[PDB]
Amino acid sequence: TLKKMLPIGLNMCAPTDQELITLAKTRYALKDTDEEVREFLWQMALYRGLPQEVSAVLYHLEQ
Amino acid sequence: RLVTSPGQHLLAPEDVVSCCLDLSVPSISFRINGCPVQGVFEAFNLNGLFFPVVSFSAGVKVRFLLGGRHGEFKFLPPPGYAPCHEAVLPRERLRLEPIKEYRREGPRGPHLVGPSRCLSHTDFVPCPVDTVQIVLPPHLERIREKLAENIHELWALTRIEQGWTYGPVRDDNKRLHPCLVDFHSLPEPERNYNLQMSGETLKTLLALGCHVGMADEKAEDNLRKTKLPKTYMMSNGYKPAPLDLSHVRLTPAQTTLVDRLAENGHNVWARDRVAQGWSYSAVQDIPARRNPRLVPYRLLDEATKRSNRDSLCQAVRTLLGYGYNIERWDRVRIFRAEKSYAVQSGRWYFEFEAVTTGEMRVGWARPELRPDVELGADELAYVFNGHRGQRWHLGSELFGRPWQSGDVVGCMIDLTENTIIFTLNGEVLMSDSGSETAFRDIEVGDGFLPVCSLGPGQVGHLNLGQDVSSLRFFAICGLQEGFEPFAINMQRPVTTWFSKSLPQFEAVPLEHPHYEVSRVDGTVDTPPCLRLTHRTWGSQNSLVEMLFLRLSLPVQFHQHFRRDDPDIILNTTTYYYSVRVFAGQEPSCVWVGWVTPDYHQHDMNFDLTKVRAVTVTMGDEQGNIHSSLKCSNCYMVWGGDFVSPGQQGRISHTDLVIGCLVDLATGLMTFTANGKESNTFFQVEPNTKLFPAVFVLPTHQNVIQFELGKQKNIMPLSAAMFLSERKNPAPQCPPRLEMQMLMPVSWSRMPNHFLRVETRRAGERLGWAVQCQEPLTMMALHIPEENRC
Amino acid sequence: LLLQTNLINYVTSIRPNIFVGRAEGTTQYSKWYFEVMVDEVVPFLTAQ
Amino acid sequence: GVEIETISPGDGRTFPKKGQTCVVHYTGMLQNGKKFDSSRDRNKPFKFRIGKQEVIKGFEEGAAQMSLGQRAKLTCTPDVAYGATGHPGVIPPNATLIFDVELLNLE
């Protein structure tokens, strides 16, 4: 519906966690519960210049 | 060419060079240290404008001296020559600039520059409407009188406001004027002049196409006059009383007529003054008859234009008071990335900044883009235009909104979804349908490259993102979506190519839409031939325009000048060539001859008077001339010289054959037509290269044929082009010999570094200064047969 | 026959913004004059 | 013989004498305008002794008439330089040579 705020959420996570984001995206592909997934466990230069839950959103929007 | 001077040497420090130009009888002369040089240029073309120029390489320092307060001359100019500083236009200021640049240095980086508008020598001749025969209609005679009366009242009021008072003899110090009287009390000749001027305002309105006619018959008796206080009264009892026109409002069409009326008056005045021998000059000289305002109205200063417009506007309000009603080819430049940088996958982003608002275009292009087609007019590019929000790919569509100075456009391409997106100042541009993407469903093909196009007088800046911190709106839109700068992780700046508008000769493509070239073998009675034909002469989409064709290989003259029987033909050194024009093609539209390696004129109105030519004359100290040489780059003859007298057009269906003969040992070139001699001949210097060439304008299905034949005791052309065939009298056409045609534009590579040149005003006495210090070098590849680098 | 190679220098040109021409009925004068002074020059900064 | 034209004037008093050594910078091209040699490319001045048949005739005759610091141009006819045999792979037979010579130092 209204996903103009997705970049704001994406800005919260550092690029290093990118490899995590896809991995959990597979767990929601198996219809796993949120609690289990929580239990189941130059870009940097620009990120450092400034003073999980997202993967569910991308997985849901992938449909 | 060498010249004689007292104490000859190459230019050295403390030398002074003086240049003199005489437009009358084209003449250019030089003096060094006050001693004249014994050589002159003359008899050159006169179209266009002339300017001084100095050319140099690294490691020089010079100063320009132009006279006046821009550098004092070290020697007295010849008696009739004027200083250059007098030639500055009223709207401009003196400065130093380069010639036809396409790049500039800026604060945040280099700027790209489009073509520059320039004046022409026909912009200095005034052309009035010439409405002499025009005669004011009878129904406008009353208003002519009333108009003159009010113009007088207004004039008198202005004088009186500025302290003028009546006296019988004009005195400009005491501000006494005899015309400060009632209109009816002026001397008859002055009244008549005023009536003539009023009538010519009316006649000029009519010549400009105005409809002038009575509309409100009540308006006149409702007019009132301005009532001035007694302090505006002259000693003779006269007090001006101009009409109160405060209620009158010019319509837009009437304002435009005021504006148009003025220019015509200034132009006719300027033409009248020029007819008596006056001229323009930045400084006034009454005895020399030079005035600082003798230019056409377009080039005048704003203050003078407004001052001239004021009186005409006043007259227009007065007239409306009485109830009357009155009712490619260097036009664009294209820059693009190099072919090696084409991308076939990923998501990419770059930025473009518009320094000026105008006709500019930006987007993505295919590697095989053409230089002579407008950007986006075909299927090879996807482009956004900001002057008027539009998107271009195989057509024009409305899109986005217009930009302003300093705006930044971000271009993004996605090759996973095959989409193209444009953003303006971080805001995504969308069409009327509300779609976010500008283009979709794009086939990858070979890849895409950044491309931009600039019109006349425009300036722009391009950023491919070598430094991420330099981008301004990348983080706002594009960073989180997964887009990357185009030039990231690159050690050196990206190489750029641009469109160069210099005509060059190129081979005819094997699949050209309109033209076809055929090779014909030699029979028992015919020589080998190269024939040209038109493919679509009669169709609706036919293309008809001038054609400049030449052969591929040249002939060269020697270093020194000093039924066939073999004894004559083995040492003849004379060569022959032929051209056949078929019946149906008008012989009045064909020029035949030779060209030099440096012909670059793509002219659509070609004529034998357009050929560049010059004469260099050498003389002695006592005034005796030693030699005079003529230089040109085209030696041709016109077909119309060989048409039959009184011929009724192309009614006669007969072919025409023109032959050319050259002597490589004496430098003499001659022509024959239908076996008859011609009076034209040419003489050239040793060590010269020549190419056979034909200029044509098609008028029939079959146009022309090159014939490599042979005459008695004269060798064919093949014996002059190829070394192994130097003694073979049998004509032949090897595969290396082919026909070429002239092309207007091409591609060129931009250098990586440029010379640094500094200019400044050295001083009021010293003049202007130019200086260059840092050397630069390049590696050049040379093609010998075309004499090119 | 074979393509040639060499090393060459860059050159450039400089002009003022004064323009002069001739035509029928033109408003411009016909004769002009100007001067140039040389202060410094290095005969061989490079091999050329 | 050889023709000499002055490009830049020199001392005008000192001339090469017998037994001395001349140090020069030169550039040689064919009559057609094609360069074939240059000592400035190698960045080392050329040094030769006059009268010991070390170089071709025309170069020596041209250098004999130049003063110290002068810069001039020389022209050599085929019968003076390499004749009708030429220089195999460099100079074609029967070629006229043009040189641009600057005289730097003597002995």
Coordinates of all heavy atoms in Angstrom, one line a residue, chain B residues 14-15 17-23 49-52 54-56 61-63 65 74 80-84 93-94 97 124 280 777-782, chain C residues 3-8 10-22 24-25 27-42:
Chain B
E14 N 62.0 41.5 -27.4 CA 62.1 42.9 -27.7 C 61.7 43.3 -29.2 O 62.1 44.4 -29.6 CB 63.5 43.5 -27.4 CG 64.1 43.1 -26.1 CD 63.6 44.0 -24.9 OE1 62.5 44.5 -25.0 OE2 64.4 44.2 -24.0
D15 N 61.1 42.4 -29.9 CA 60.6 42.6 -31.2 C 59.2 43.2 -31.2 O 58.4 42.9 -30.3 CB 60.7 41.4 -32.1 CG 62.1 41.1 -32.6 OD1 62.8 42.1 -32.8 OD2 62.3 39.9 -32.9
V17 N 55.9 43.9 -33.9 CA 55.3 43.6 -35.2 C 54.0 44.4 -35.3 O 53.2 44.4 -34.4 CB 55.0 42.1 -35.3 CG1 54.6 41.7 -36.7 CG2 56.2 41.2 -34.9
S18 N 53.9 45.1 -36.5 CA 52.7 45.9 -36.8 C 52.0 45.3 -38.0 O 52.7 45.0 -39.0 CB 53.1 47.3 -37.0 OG 54.4 47.4 -37.6
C19 N 50.7 45.1 -37.9 CA 49.9 44.6 -38.9 C 48.9 45.6 -39.4 O 48.3 46.3 -38.6 CB 49.2 43.3 -38.5 SG 50.3 42.0 -37.7
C20 N 48.8 45.7 -40.7 CA 47.9 46.6 -41.4 C 47.0 45.9 -42.4 O 47.4 45.0 -43.1 CB 48.7 47.7 -42.2 SG 50.1 48.4 -41.3
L21 N 45.7 46.2 -42.3 CA 44.7 45.6 -43.2 C 43.9 46.6 -43.9 O 43.4 47.6 -43.3 CB 43.7 44.7 -42.3 CG 42.4 44.3 -43.0 CD1 42.7 43.3 -44.1 CD2 41.4 43.8 -42.0
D22 N 43.7 46.4 -45.2 CA 42.9 47.3 -46.0 C 41.8 46.5 -46.7 O 42.1 45.7 -47.6 CB 43.7 48.1 -47.1 CG 43.0 49.3 -47.7 OD1 41.8 49.5 -47.3 OD2 43.6 50.0 -48.5
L23 N 40.5 46.7 -46.2 CA 39.4 46.0 -46.8 C 39.3 46.4 -48.2 O 39.2 45.5 -49.1 CB 38.1 46.4 -46.0 CG 38.0 45.9 -44.6 CD1 36.9 46.6 -43.9 CD2 37.7 44.4 -44.6
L49 N 33.8 38.1 -41.4 CA 34.5 39.1 -40.7 C 35.9 38.7 -40.3 O 36.2 37.6 -40.3 CB 33.7 39.5 -39.4 CG 32.2 39.9 -39.5 CD1 31.6 40.0 -38.1 CD2 32.1 41.2 -40.3
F50 N 36.7 39.7 -40.2 CA 38.2 39.5 -39.9 C 38.5 39.9 -38.4 O 37.9 40.8 -37.9 CB 39.0 40.4 -40.8 CG 39.0 39.9 -42.3 CD1 37.9 40.2 -43.1 CD2 40.0 39.1 -42.8 CE1 37.9 39.8 -44.4 CE2 40.0 38.7 -44.1 CZ 38.9 39.0 -44.9
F51 N 39.4 39.2 -37.8 CA 39.9 39.5 -36.5 C 41.4 39.2 -36.4 O 41.9 38.3 -37.1 CB 39.1 38.8 -35.4 CG 39.1 37.3 -35.6 CD1 40.1 36.5 -35.0 CD2 38.1 36.7 -36.3 CE1 40.1 35.2 -35.2 CE2 38.1 35.3 -36.4 CZ 39.1 34.5 -35.9
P52 N 42.1 40.0 -35.5 CA 43.5 39.6 -35.3 C 43.6 38.4 -34.5 O 42.7 38.0 -33.7 CB 44.0 40.8 -34.5 CG 43.0 41.9 -34.6 CD 41.7 41.2 -34.8
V54 N 46.8 35.5 -32.7 CA 48.2 35.1 -32.4 C 48.2 33.6 -32.0 O 47.4 33.2 -31.1 CB 48.9 36.0 -31.4 CG1 48.1 36.0 -30.1 CG2 50.3 35.5 -31.2
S55 N 49.0 32.8 -32.6 CA 49.1 31.4 -32.3 C 50.5 31.1 -31.7 O 51.5 31.6 -32.1 CB 48.8 30.5 -33.5 OG 50.0 30.5 -34.4
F56 N 50.5 30.1 -30.8 CA 51.7 29.9 -30.0 C 51.7 28.5 -29.4 O 50.6 27.8 -29.4 CB 52.0 30.9 -29.0 CG 50.9 31.1 -28.0 CD1 50.8 30.3 -26.8 CD2 49.8 32.0 -28.2 CE1 49.8 30.4 -25.9 CE2 48.8 32.1 -27.3 CZ 48.8 31.3 -26.2
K61 N 55.7 34.7 -24.0 CA 55.0 35.9 -23.4 C 54.9 37.0 -24.4 O 56.0 37.4 -24.9 CB 55.8 36.3 -22.1 CG 55.8 35.3 -21.0 CD 56.7 35.8 -19.8 CE 56.9 34.7 -18.8 NZ 58.0 35.0 -17.9
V62 N 53.7 37.4 -24.6 CA 53.5 38.5 -25.6 C 52.5 39.5 -25.1 O 51.8 39.3 -24.1 CB 53.0 38.0 -27.0 CG1 54.0 37.0 -27.6 CG2 51.7 37.2 -26.8
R63 N 52.4 40.7 -25.7 CA 51.5 41.7 -25.3 C 50.8 42.3 -26.6 O 51.5 42.6 -27.6 CB 52.2 42.8 -24.5 CG 52.4 42.5 -23.1 CD 53.1 43.6 -22.3 NE 54.5 43.8 -22.7 CZ 54.9 44.9 -23.3 NH1 54.1 45.9 -23.7 NH2 56.2 44.9 -23.6
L65 N 48.9 45.4 -28.3 CA 48.8 46.9 -28.3 C 47.8 47.2 -29.4 O 48.0 47.0 -30.6 CB 50.2 47.5 -28.6 CG 51.4 47.1 -27.7 CD1 52.7 47.7 -28.2 CD2 51.1 47.4 -26.3
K74 N 54.2 51.9 -30.6 CA 55.6 52.3 -30.6 C 56.0 53.0 -32.0 O 57.1 53.5 -32.1 CB 56.5 51.1 -30.4 CG 56.0 50.2 -29.3 CD 56.3 50.8 -27.9 CE 57.8 50.6 -27.5 NZ 58.0 51.0 -26.1
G80 N 46.2 56.6 -43.4 CA 44.8 56.4 -43.5 C 44.2 55.2 -42.6 O 43.1 54.9 -42.7
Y81 N 45.1 54.7 -41.7 CA 44.7 53.5 -40.9 C 44.3 53.9 -39.5 O 44.9 54.8 -38.9 CB 45.8 52.5 -40.9 CG 46.1 51.9 -42.2 CD1 46.6 52.6 -43.3 CD2 45.9 50.5 -42.4 CE1 46.9 52.0 -44.5 CE2 46.2 49.9 -43.6 CZ 46.7 50.7 -44.6 OH 46.9 50.1 -45.9
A82 N 43.2 53.3 -39.0 CA 42.6 53.6 -37.7 C 43.0 52.6 -36.7 O 43.3 51.4 -37.0 CB 41.1 53.7 -37.8
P83 N 43.1 53.0 -35.4 CA 43.5 52.1 -34.3 C 42.3 51.1 -34.1 O 41.2 51.3 -34.4 CB 43.6 53.0 -33.1 CG 43.9 54.3 -33.6 CD 43.1 54.4 -34.9
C84 N 42.7 49.9 -33.6 CA 41.7 48.8 -33.5 C 40.7 49.0 -32.4 O 39.6 48.6 -32.5 CB 42.4 47.5 -33.3 SG 42.9 46.6 -34.8
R93 N 32.5 44.9 -24.2 CA 33.7 45.4 -23.5 C 34.9 44.6 -24.0 O 34.8 43.4 -24.3 CB 33.6 45.3 -22.0 CG 32.9 46.5 -21.4 CD 32.6 46.3 -19.9 NE 33.6 45.5 -19.2 CZ 34.6 46.1 -18.5 NH1 34.7 47.4 -18.4 NH2 35.5 45.3 -17.9
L94 N 36.0 45.3 -24.1 CA 37.2 44.6 -24.7 C 37.7 43.5 -23.7 O 37.8 43.7 -22.5 CB 38.3 45.7 -24.9 CG 39.5 45.2 -25.7 CD1 39.1 44.6 -27.1 CD2 40.4 46.4 -26.0
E97 N 39.9 36.2 -25.5 CA 39.1 34.9 -25.4 C 39.7 33.9 -26.4 O 40.4 34.3 -27.4 CB 37.6 35.2 -25.8 CG 37.4 35.9 -27.1 CD 36.0 36.0 -27.5 OE1 35.1 36.2 -26.6 OE2 35.7 35.8 -28.7
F124 N 25.6 44.6 -40.5 CA 26.1 46.0 -40.3 C 25.5 46.9 -41.5 O 26.0 48.0 -41.6 CB 27.6 46.0 -40.3 CG 28.2 45.5 -39.0 CD1 28.5 44.2 -38.9 CD2 28.4 46.4 -38.0 CE1 29.0 43.7 -37.7 CE2 29.0 46.0 -36.8 CZ 29.3 44.6 -36.6
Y280 N 31.1 54.4 -38.6 CA 31.1 54.2 -37.1 C 32.5 54.3 -36.5 O 33.5 54.0 -37.1 CB 30.4 52.9 -36.8 CG 30.5 52.5 -35.4 CD1 29.7 53.0 -34.4 CD2 31.5 51.6 -34.9 CE1 29.7 52.6 -33.1 CE2 31.6 51.2 -33.6 CZ 30.7 51.7 -32.7 OH 30.8 51.4 -31.4
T777 N 52.9 17.3 -24.8 CA 53.3 16.5 -26.0 C 52.3 15.4 -26.2 O 51.6 14.9 -25.3 CB 54.7 15.9 -25.8 OG1 55.6 17.0 -25.3 CG2 55.3 15.4 -27.1
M778 N 52.2 15.0 -27.5 CA 51.3 13.9 -27.9 C 52.0 13.0 -28.9 O 52.8 13.5 -29.7 CB 49.9 14.4 -28.3 CG 49.8 14.6 -29.8 SD 48.1 14.8 -30.3 CE 48.1 14.1 -32.0
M779 N 51.5 11.8 -29.0 CA 52.0 10.9 -30.0 C 51.0 10.8 -31.2 O 49.9 10.5 -31.0 CB 52.2 9.5 -29.5 CG 53.1 8.6 -30.3 SD 53.9 7.3 -29.3 CE 53.9 5.9 -30.5
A780 N 51.5 11.2 -32.4 CA 50.7 11.3 -33.6 C 50.9 10.2 -34.6 O 52.1 9.9 -34.9 CB 50.9 12.7 -34.2
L781 N 49.9 9.7 -35.2 CA 49.9 8.7 -36.2 C 49.5 9.4 -37.6 O 48.5 10.1 -37.6 CB 48.9 7.6 -35.9 CG 48.9 6.4 -37.0 CD1 50.0 5.4 -36.7 CD2 47.5 5.7 -36.9
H782 N 50.3 9.2 -38.6 CA 50.2 9.9 -39.8 C 49.9 8.9 -41.0 O 50.6 7.9 -41.2 CB 51.5 10.6 -40.1 CG 51.5 11.4 -41.4 ND1 50.9 12.6 -41.6 CD2 52.0 11.1 -42.7 CE1 51.1 13.0 -42.8 NE2 51.7 12.1 -43.5
Chain C
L3 N 51.9 3.2 -41.9 CA 51.5 4.4 -41.2 C 52.7 4.9 -40.4 O 53.5 4.1 -39.9 CB 50.3 4.1 -40.2 CG 49.2 3.3 -40.8 CD1 48.2 2.8 -39.7 CD2 48.4 4.2 -41.8
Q4 N 52.8 6.2 -40.2 CA 54.0 6.8 -39.6 C 53.6 7.3 -38.2 O 52.4 7.4 -37.9 CB 54.5 8.0 -40.4 CG 54.7 7.7 -41.8 CD 55.7 6.6 -42.1 OE1 56.9 6.7 -41.6 NE2 55.3 5.6 -42.8
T5 N 54.6 7.4 -37.3 CA 54.4 7.9 -35.9 C 55.4 8.9 -35.6 O 56.6 8.9 -36.1 CB 54.5 6.7 -34.9 OG1 55.7 6.0 -35.1 CG2 53.3 5.8 -35.1
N6 N 55.1 9.8 -34.7 CA 56.0 10.9 -34.2 C 55.5 11.5 -32.9 O 54.4 11.1 -32.4 CB 56.3 11.9 -35.2 CG 57.7 12.4 -35.2 OD1 58.5 12.0 -34.3 ND2 58.1 13.2 -36.2
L7 N 56.2 12.4 -32.3 CA 55.9 13.2 -31.1 C 55.8 14.6 -31.5 O 56.7 15.2 -32.1 CB 56.9 12.9 -30.0 CG 56.5 11.9 -28.9 CD1 56.3 10.5 -29.5 CD2 57.5 11.9 -27.8
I8 N 54.6 15.3 -31.1 CA 54.4 16.7 -31.5 C 53.9 17.4 -30.3 O 53.4 16.9 -29.3 CB 53.4 16.8 -32.7 CG1 52.0 16.3 -32.2 CG2 53.8 15.9 -33.9 CD1 50.9 16.7 -33.2
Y10 N 51.5 20.6 -28.6 CA 50.2 21.3 -28.7 C 50.4 22.8 -28.9 O 51.3 23.4 -28.4 CB 49.3 21.1 -27.4 CG 48.7 19.7 -27.3 CD1 49.4 18.8 -26.5 CD2 47.5 19.4 -27.9 CE1 48.8 17.5 -26.3 CE2 47.0 18.1 -27.8 CZ 47.6 17.2 -27.0 OH 47.1 15.9 -26.8
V11 N 49.5 23.4 -29.8 CA 49.5 24.8 -30.0 C 48.1 25.3 -29.8 O 47.1 24.6 -29.8 CB 50.0 25.1 -31.4 CG1 51.2 24.3 -31.8 CG2 48.9 24.9 -32.5
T12 N 48.0 26.6 -29.6 CA 46.7 27.3 -29.4 C 46.7 28.7 -29.9 O 47.8 29.3 -30.1 CB 46.3 27.2 -27.9 OG1 45.0 27.7 -27.7 CG2 47.2 28.1 -27.1
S13 N 45.5 29.3 -30.0 CA 45.4 30.6 -30.6 C 44.6 31.5 -29.6 O 43.8 31.0 -28.9 CB 44.7 30.6 -32.0 OG 45.2 29.5 -32.8
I14 N 44.9 32.8 -29.7 CA 44.2 33.8 -28.9 C 43.9 35.0 -29.8 O 44.7 35.5 -30.6 CB 45.1 34.2 -27.7 CG1 45.1 33.1 -26.6 CG2 44.7 35.5 -27.1 CD1 43.8 33.0 -25.9
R15 N 42.7 35.6 -29.5 CA 42.2 36.7 -30.3 C 41.5 37.7 -29.3 O 41.1 37.3 -28.2 CB 41.2 36.3 -31.3 CG 39.8 36.0 -30.8 CD 38.7 35.8 -31.8 NE 37.5 35.4 -31.2 CZ 36.5 34.7 -31.8 NH1 36.7 34.3 -33.1 NH2 35.4 34.4 -31.2
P16 N 41.4 39.0 -29.7 CA 40.4 39.8 -29.0 C 39.1 39.7 -29.7 O 38.9 39.0 -30.7 CB 41.1 41.2 -29.2 CG 41.8 41.1 -30.5 CD 42.3 39.7 -30.6
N17 N 38.1 40.5 -29.2 CA 36.7 40.4 -29.7 C 36.4 41.5 -30.6 O 35.3 42.0 -30.7 CB 35.8 40.4 -28.5 CG 35.9 41.6 -27.6 OD1 36.8 42.4 -27.7 ND2 34.9 41.9 -26.8
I18 N 37.4 42.0 -31.5 CA 37.2 43.0 -32.5 C 36.9 42.3 -33.8 O 37.7 41.5 -34.2 CB 38.4 43.9 -32.5 CG1 38.4 44.9 -31.3 CG2 38.3 44.7 -33.8 CD1 39.8 45.3 -30.9
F19 N 35.8 42.7 -34.5 CA 35.4 42.1 -35.7 C 35.2 43.2 -36.8 O 34.6 44.3 -36.5 CB 34.1 41.3 -35.6 CG 34.2 40.2 -34.5 CD1 33.6 40.4 -33.3 CD2 34.8 39.0 -34.8 CE1 33.7 39.4 -32.3 CE2 34.9 38.1 -33.8 CZ 34.4 38.3 -32.6
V20 N 35.7 43.0 -38.0 CA 35.7 44.0 -39.1 C 35.4 43.3 -40.4 O 35.9 42.2 -40.6 CB 37.0 44.7 -39.1 CG1 37.2 45.4 -40.5 CG2 37.1 45.7 -38.0
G21 N 34.5 43.9 -41.2 CA 34.1 43.3 -42.5 C 33.8 44.4 -43.5 O 33.9 45.6 -43.2
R22 N 33.4 43.9 -44.7 CA 33.1 44.8 -45.8 C 31.9 44.3 -46.5 O 31.8 43.0 -46.7 CB 34.3 45.0 -46.7 CG 34.1 46.3 -47.6 CD 35.1 46.3 -48.8 NE 34.5 45.7 -50.0 CZ 35.1 45.6 -51.1 NH1 36.4 45.9 -51.3 NH2 34.4 45.1 -52.2
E24 N 28.2 45.8 -49.2 CA 27.5 46.9 -49.9 C 26.6 47.6 -48.9 O 25.8 47.1 -48.3 CB 26.7 46.3 -51.0 CG 27.6 46.0 -52.3 CD 28.3 47.1 -52.9 OE1 27.8 48.3 -52.7 OE2 29.3 46.9 -53.6
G25 N 26.9 48.9 -48.8 CA 26.1 49.8 -47.9 C 26.4 49.6 -46.4 O 25.6 49.9 -45.5
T27 N 28.3 50.0 -42.7 CA 28.6 51.2 -41.8 C 30.0 51.1 -41.2 O 30.3 51.9 -40.3 CB 27.6 51.2 -40.7 OG1 27.6 50.1 -39.9 CG2 26.2 51.4 -41.3
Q28 N 30.9 50.3 -41.7 CA 32.2 50.1 -41.1 C 33.3 50.7 -41.9 O 33.2 50.9 -43.1 CB 32.5 48.6 -40.9 CG 31.4 47.9 -40.2 CD 31.9 46.6 -39.5 OE1 32.3 45.6 -40.1 NE2 32.0 46.7 -38.1
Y29 N 34.4 51.1 -41.2 CA 35.5 51.7 -41.9 C 36.3 50.6 -42.6 O 36.1 49.4 -42.4 CB 36.4 52.5 -40.9 CG 37.4 53.4 -41.5 CD1 37.0 54.3 -42.6 CD2 38.7 53.5 -41.0 CE1 37.9 55.1 -43.1 CE2 39.6 54.3 -41.6 CZ 39.2 55.1 -42.6 OH 40.2 56.0 -43.2
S30 N 37.3 51.0 -43.4 CA 37.9 50.1 -44.3 C 39.4 49.8 -44.0 O 39.9 48.8 -44.6 CB 37.9 50.7 -45.8 OG 36.5 51.0 -46.1
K31 N 40.1 50.5 -43.1 CA 41.5 50.3 -42.9 C 41.8 50.2 -41.4 O 41.2 50.9 -40.6 CB 42.3 51.5 -43.5 CG 42.0 51.8 -45.0 CD 43.0 52.8 -45.5 CE 42.6 53.0 -47.0 NZ 43.6 54.0 -47.6
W32 N 42.6 49.3 -41.0 CA 42.9 49.0 -39.6 C 44.3 48.6 -39.4 O 45.1 48.2 -40.3 CB 41.9 47.9 -39.1 CG 40.5 48.2 -39.3 CD1 39.7 47.9 -40.3 CD2 39.7 49.0 -38.4 NE1 38.4 48.4 -40.2 CE2 38.4 49.1 -39.0 CE3 39.9 49.6 -37.1 CZ2 37.3 49.7 -38.3 CZ3 38.8 50.2 -36.5 CH2 37.6 50.3 -37.1
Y33 N 44.8 48.7 -38.1 CA 46.2 48.6 -37.8 C 46.3 48.2 -36.3 O 45.5 48.6 -35.5 CB 46.9 49.9 -38.0 CG 48.3 50.0 -37.5 CD1 49.4 49.7 -38.3 CD2 48.6 50.4 -36.2 CE1 50.7 49.8 -37.8 CE2 49.8 50.5 -35.7 CZ 50.9 50.2 -36.6 OH 52.2 50.3 -36.1
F34 N 47.2 47.3 -36.0 CA 47.4 46.9 -34.6 C 48.9 46.4 -34.4 O 49.6 46.2 -35.4 CB 46.4 45.9 -34.1 CG 46.8 44.4 -34.5 CD1 47.4 43.6 -33.6 CD2 46.5 43.9 -35.8 CE1 47.7 42.3 -33.9 CE2 46.8 42.6 -36.1 CZ 47.4 41.8 -35.2
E35 N 49.3 46.2 -33.2 CA 50.7 45.8 -32.9 C 50.8 44.8 -31.8 O 49.9 44.6 -31.0 CB 51.5 47.0 -32.5 CG 51.7 48.1 -33.6 CD 52.8 49.0 -33.3 OE1 53.1 49.3 -32.1 OE2 53.4 49.5 -34.3
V36 N 51.9 44.0 -31.9 CA 52.2 42.9 -30.9 C 53.7 43.1 -30.5 O 54.5 43.3 -31.3 CB 51.9 41.5 -31.5 CG1 52.4 40.5 -30.5 CG2 50.5 41.4 -31.9
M37 N 53.9 42.9 -29.2 CA 55.3 43.0 -28.7 C 55.6 41.6 -28.0 O 54.8 41.0 -27.3 CB 55.4 44.1 -27.7 CG 56.7 44.3 -27.0 SD 57.2 46.0 -26.7 CE 59.0 45.8 -26.4
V38 N 56.8 41.2 -28.2 CA 57.3 39.9 -27.6 C 58.2 40.2 -26.5 O 59.1 41.0 -26.5 CB 58.0 39.1 -28.7 CG1 58.4 37.7 -28.2 CG2 57.2 39.0 -30.0
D39 N 58.0 39.5 -25.3 CA 58.8 39.7 -24.1 C 59.8 38.6 -23.9 O 60.9 38.8 -23.5 CB 57.9 39.9 -22.9 CG 57.2 41.2 -22.9 OD1 57.6 42.1 -23.6 OD2 56.2 41.3 -22.1
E40 N 59.4 37.3 -24.1 CA 60.2 36.2 -23.7 C 59.8 35.0 -24.6 O 58.6 34.8 -24.9 CB 60.0 35.8 -22.2 CG 60.8 34.6 -21.8 CD 60.8 34.4 -20.3 OE1 60.3 35.3 -19.6 OE2 61.2 33.3 -19.8
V41 N 60.8 34.2 -25.0 CA 60.6 33.0 -25.8 C 61.8 32.1 -25.6 O 62.9 32.5 -25.6 CB 60.4 33.3 -27.3 CG1 61.5 34.2 -27.8 CG2 60.2 32.1 -28.1
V42 N 61.5 30.8 -25.4 CA 62.5 29.7 -25.2 C 62.6 29.0 -26.5 O 61.6 28.4 -27.0 CB 62.1 28.8 -24.1 CG1 63.2 27.7 -24.0 CG2 62.0 29.5 -22.7

